[PDB]
Amino acid sequence: AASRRLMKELEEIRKCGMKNFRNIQVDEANLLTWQGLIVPDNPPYDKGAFRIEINFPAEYPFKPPKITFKTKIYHPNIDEKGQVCLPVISAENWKPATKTDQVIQSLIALVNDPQPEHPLRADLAEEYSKDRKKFCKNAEEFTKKYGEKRP
Amino acid sequence: MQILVKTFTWKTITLEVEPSDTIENVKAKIQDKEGIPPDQQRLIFAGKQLEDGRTLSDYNIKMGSSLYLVLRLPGQ
Amino acid sequence: RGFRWKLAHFRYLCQSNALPSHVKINVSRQTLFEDSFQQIMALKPYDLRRRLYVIFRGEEGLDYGGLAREWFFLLSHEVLNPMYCLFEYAGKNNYCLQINPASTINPDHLSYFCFIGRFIAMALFHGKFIDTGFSLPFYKRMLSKKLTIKDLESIDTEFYNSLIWIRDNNIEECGLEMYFSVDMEILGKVTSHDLKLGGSNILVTEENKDEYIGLMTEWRFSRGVQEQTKAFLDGFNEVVPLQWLQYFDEKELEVMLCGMQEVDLADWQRNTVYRHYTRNSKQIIWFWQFVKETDNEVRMRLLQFVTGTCRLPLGGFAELMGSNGPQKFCIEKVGKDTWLPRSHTCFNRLDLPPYKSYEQLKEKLLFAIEETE
């Protein structure tokens, strides 16, 4: 730090209201690591909350951030090592003008309703595409057991 | 706890470890998981080269920390 | 006066400049790097132009048999191994060497880069190939050619896209908080570089944007390896004058250090994909007729045009990697035909405008791929 863009971004995440994302504490030596909580609204994750880490590369905003889920989760696009294939921050769509609050917003959007035409976990993908409801009940005992509170 | 020792060959080796463990112990866990003899290993953390005989906590290695594994040149 | 000729020229320069007698390189496989580095460093550049006698002790008199163009393969594999922290891979998924800024953690790193410089020049000088080579920007530096923003695409694609995004968009109402400085992590430790005086306090805006883009581009190529690079070029130049290289481009120099690779024309066709073309559009039919017809050197050059390298992964075309992950050789149909074909090495993609005659496709493709300055 340096990291004068990361400050403005932290400021305009804390004050942006952030209903679905909270308890955002940060490594304040260089704001290159954030931790926060995702609080899904629609089922099958509305009975849970999820610790994530956001890792900013040293050359941010030239390279995108990396999001990992610290809390386990049952999602066709999040592997069991917590990696989320979130398109807006992929190495192919990353723009410099993209702010972290838009990142989160699209992460939420991904939690609320997945997209299984491209999945990190194929099972799941098909268990969503076919059988939308056998998915949810399993997602629910996963979030019930493994996810966090409040929400 | 659990740490990631990262190489420049893009292998991430996960190690099972306690804050009590010495740098020598962690080198030993590397020799066992990779075959690399400790006398030719270099561990670095957050820009500090980890001296043998100290411990993970002296260096404040919390969990999920990434070490870096580099080899010593054969000659020296 | 193309590659064939450049090659004869370079070979003649070497022949015509070789000292007599021989030079003894005594190593053993078990201690190949330390023995090599010891042997080569004790000799004068001139001596490295005498005849080469390599001994592998313990294999000593039967064989050879042999021999050590094996030393060149084996050693190249040792000294260029990123584990040792002298050179590093260019990206996660593409595997051609560049200098690692972390190299300083080696007690005398400038010596080892001088060694390696000598070593490679020895390879060119004695017409021996080495196992894996360097990135194309690396080669351009050796030829003293200027590195440009498009040279970035191959070695750091995200940094490239970001750079270009900033060139091609108005940013005034964009709240980018960009300053003339830039940070880099090495071995876990983060450091700050100003790009001009007090650059960390100068704000990037529409009016300085171009200057900024400029300096970033240098910095990204140059960052943390000025001294190792000079050590290398010096070590190389003592053995084989860099000026002997002046007729070569960076792609030809790749091919001179690697051999001519084996391309299985079947393996290629099986694993090519087509965007807005098909296996039956006769631009493609024409394409594959050109791939079968010509030289093996044209094929490598073509392989360089579309993929940024003449080498193939372990396995063949079925496992071609790009920037973001795997990506097969791909031909896509682009607009007009008053263009030349273009490529995207990070996507491994040939943009082939629909040409009007097999001869037209043949002459334009061949002009695009041979004319890379």
* List of residues 6+ apart from C95 with CB closer than 8 A: C89, C132, C313
Contact between C53 and C27 (Cβ < 8 Å): no
Number of other CB atoms surrounding residue C209 within 10 Å = 18
Burial of A149 (0-12, 13-18, 19+ CB in 10 A): exposed
Instruction: Give the C-alpha separation, B67 to B6, whole Å.
Output: 6
3-state secondary structure of A135: helix
Instruction: Give the C-alpha separation, C71 to C29, whole Å.
Output: 9
Spell out which residues of chain C touch residue B9, defining contact as CB-CB under 8 Å.
Answer: 81-83, 89
What end-to-end distance do the CA atoms of chain A give, in Å?
Answer: 33
- Among B45, B60, B62, B70, most C C-beta atoms within 10 A, so best to mutate, is B70
* List of residues 6+ apart from A131 with CB closer than 8 A: none
Q: Which amino acid is at C344?
A: H
Look at B10 and C92 and tell me if their CB atoms are within 8 Å.
Answer: yes
Nearest CB partner across the interface for C183, out of A58, A64, A96: A58
Instruction: Give the C-alpha separation, C9 to C343, whole Å.
Output: 30
Contact between C154 and C171 (Cβ < 8 Å): no
Instruction: Give the C-alpha separation, B34 to A136, whole Å.
Output: 41
3-state secondary structure of A96: coil
For residue C320, give the nearest of C350, C287, C282 by alpha carbon: C350
Nearest CB partner across the interface for B76, out of C81, C107, C187: C107
Instruction: Give the C-alpha separation, C293 to C297, whole Å.
Output: 12
- Among A16, A66, A92, most C C-beta atoms within 10 A, so best to mutate, is A92
Distance of CA A125 to the CA centre of its chain: 18
Look at B8 and C187 and tell me if their CB atoms are within 8 Å.
Answer: no
Spell out which residues of chain C touch residue A10, defining contact as CB-CB under 8 Å.
Answer: none
Nearest CB partner across the interface for C112, out of B42, B70, B73: B73
For residue C331, give the nearest of C266, C366, C290, C287 by alpha carbon: C287
Residue A113 falls in which region: left (phi positive, over 0), alpha (psi -120 to 50) or beta: beta
Look at C83 and B76 and tell me if their CB atoms are within 8 Å.
Answer: no
Instruction: Give the C-alpha separation, A105 to A64, whole Å.
Output: 15
Provide the b/e sequence for C221-251 (b: ≥16 CB within 10 Å).
Answer: beebbeebbebbbbbbbbbbeeebbeebbbb
Q: Which amino acid is at A29?
A: A
Greatest CA separation found in chain C?
75
* List of residues 6+ apart from C321 with CB closer than 8 A: C93, C94, C313, C327
3-state secondary structure of B31: helix
DSSP B72: P
Instruction: Give the C-alpha separation, A100 to A8, whole Å.
Output: 10
Number of other CB atoms surrounding residue C149 within 10 Å = 15
Q: For residue C203, what is the domain's CATH number?
A: 3.30.2160.10
Q: For residue C281, what is the domain's CATH number?
A: 3.30.2410.10
What does each C-alpha distance from A85 to A59, A71, C3 come to in angstroms? 21, 16, 45
What's the token pair of residue C117? 């410089």
Instruction: Give the C-alpha separation, C291 to C300, whole Å.
Output: 10
Look at C189 and B47 and tell me if their CB atoms are within 8 Å.
Answer: yes
Hey, is the C-beta of B47 within 8 angstroms of any chain C C-beta?
Answer: yes
Contact between C234 and C242 (Cβ < 8 Å): no
Strands of the sheet with C330-332, listed across from one edge: C273-275, C330-332, C349-351, C342-344
What's the token pair of residue A3? 């990291």
Spell out which residues of chain A touch residue C179, defining contact as CB-CB under 8 Å.
Answer: 4
Hey, is the C-beta of B74 within 8 angstroms of any chain C C-beta?
Answer: yes
Kindly report the three-state secondary structure assignment for every residue of chain C: CCHHHHHHHHHHHHHCCCCCCEEEEEECHHHHHHHHHHHHHCCCHHHHHCEEEEEECCCCCCCCCCCCCHHHHHHHHHHCCHHHCCEEECCCCCCCEEECHHHHHCCCHHHHHHHHHHHHHHHHHHCCCCCCCECHHHHHHHCCCCCCHHHHHHHCHHHHHHHHHHHHCCCCCCCCCCECEEEEEECCEEEEEECCCCHHHCECCCCCHHHHHHHHHHHHHHCCCHHHHHHHHHHHHHHCCHHHHCCCCHHHHHHHHCCCCCCCHHHHHHCCEEECCCCCCHHHHHHHHHHHHCCHHHHHHHHHHHHCCCCCCCCCHHHCECCCCECCCEEECCCCCCCCCEEECCCCEEECCCCCCHHHHHHHHHHHHHCCC
Whose structure tokens read 């392989």? C303
Burial of A5 (0-12, 13-18, 19+ CB in 10 A): buried
Residues of C involved in catalysis: 346
Contact between C116 and C130 (Cβ < 8 Å): no
Instruction: Give the C-alpha separation, C23 to C25, whole Å.
Output: 7
Nearest CB partner across the interface for A97, out of C157, C176, C179: C176
* List of residues 6+ apart from B36 with CB closer than 8 A: B30, B69, B71
Residue C21 falls in which region: left (phi positive, over 0), alpha (psi -120 to 50) or beta: left
* List of residues 6+ apart from A82 with CB closer than 8 A: A68, A69, A70, A72, A73
Look at A62 and C183 and tell me if their CB atoms are within 8 Å.
Answer: no
3-state secondary structure of A140: helix
Cα-flanking dihedrals φ and ψ of residue C181, to 5°? -165, 170
Strands of the sheet with A66-69, listed across from one edge: A21-26, A33-38, A50-55, A66-69
Look at C31 and B74 and tell me if their CB atoms are within 8 Å.
Answer: yes
Provide the b/e sequence for C72-98 (b: ≥16 CB within 10 Å).
Answer: bebbbebbbbbbbbbbbbbbeebbbbb
For residue C254, give the nearest of C129, C349, C347 by alpha carbon: C129
Contact between A20 and A37 (Cβ < 8 Å): no
Q: Which amino acid is at C1?
A: R
Contact between C35 and C26 (Cβ < 8 Å): yes
Instruction: Give the C-alpha separation, C347 to A129, whole Å.
Output: 30
Nearest CB partner across the interface for C181, out of A2, A8, A90: A2
Whose structure tokens read 């990696």? A83
Same domain membership, residue C284 and residue C197: no
What's the token pair of residue A17? 């209201």
Instruction: Give the C-alpha separation, C68 to C75, whole Å.
Output: 10
Nearest CB partner across the interface for C176, out of A59, A91, A96: A96
Q: Chains A and C: how many Cβ contacts under 8 Å?
A: 59
Burial of A20 (0-12, 13-18, 19+ CB in 10 A): buried
Burial of A104 (0-12, 13-18, 19+ CB in 10 A): buried
Q: Chains B and C: how many Cβ contacts under 8 Å?
A: 53
For residue B7, give the nearest of C341, A82, C85 by alpha carbon: C85
How many residues make up chain B in this entry? Answer: 76
Instruction: Give the C-alpha separation, C217 to C44, whole Å.
Output: 37
What's the token pair of residue C170? 């108005």
Hey, is the C-beta of C182 within 8 angstroms of any chain A C-beta?
Answer: yes
What's the token pair of residue C213? 């883009």
DSSP B38: G
DSSP A78: B
For residue C120, give the nearest of C97, C102, C100 by alpha carbon: C97
* Pairing assessment for the beta strands B2-7 and A66-69 based on DSSP bridges: unpaired
Query: Mind telling me how many Å the CA of B71 is from chain C's nearest CA?
Result: 5
Distance of CA A70 to the CA centre of its chain: 10
Instruction: Give the C-alpha separation, A96 to A62, whole Å.
Output: 6
Domains and CATH numbers, chain A: 1-151 (3.10.110.10)
Cα-flanking dihedrals φ and ψ of residue C212, to 5°? -60, -55
DSSP B71: E
- Among C162, C182, C187, most A C-beta atoms within 10 A, so best to mutate, is C162
Spell out which residues of chain C touch residue A99, defining contact as CB-CB under 8 Å.
Answer: 175
Calculate ∠ Cα B40-B56-C102, nearest 5°.
50
Same domain membership, residue C270 and residue C218: no
Strands in A39-150 per DSSP E:
50-55, 66-69
Number of other CB atoms surrounding residue C263 within 10 Å = 18
**Beta bridge partner(s), residue B15:** B3
Instruction: Give the C-alpha separation, A127 to A133, whole Å.
Output: 9
Residues of A involved in catalysis: 85
Contact between A94 and C158 (Cβ < 8 Å): yes
3-state secondary structure of A128: helix
In terms of CA atoms, which chain B residue is nearest residue C36? B75
Cα-flanking dihedrals φ and ψ of residue A21, to 5°? -145, 120
**Beta bridge partner(s), residue C192:** C183
Instruction: Give the C-alpha separation, C149 to C137, whole Å.
Output: 11
Helices C157-168 and C209-222 cross at an angle (nearest 10°) of 170
**Beta bridge partner(s), residue C27:** C56
* List of residues 6+ apart from C295 with CB closer than 8 A: none
- Neighbouring chains of A at 3+ CB pairs within 8 Å? C
Contact between C261 and C310 (Cβ < 8 Å): yes
Helices C109-126 and C226-239 cross at an angle (nearest 10°) of 40
Spell out which residues of chain C touch residue B49, defining contact as CB-CB under 8 Å.
Answer: 105
In terms of CA atoms, which chain B residue is nearest residue C101? B8
Residues spanned by the domain of C186:
149-222
3-state secondary structure of A4: helix
Look at A97 and C169 and tell me if their CB atoms are within 8 Å.
Answer: yes
3-state secondary structure of B36: coil
Same domain membership, residue C364 and residue C272: yes
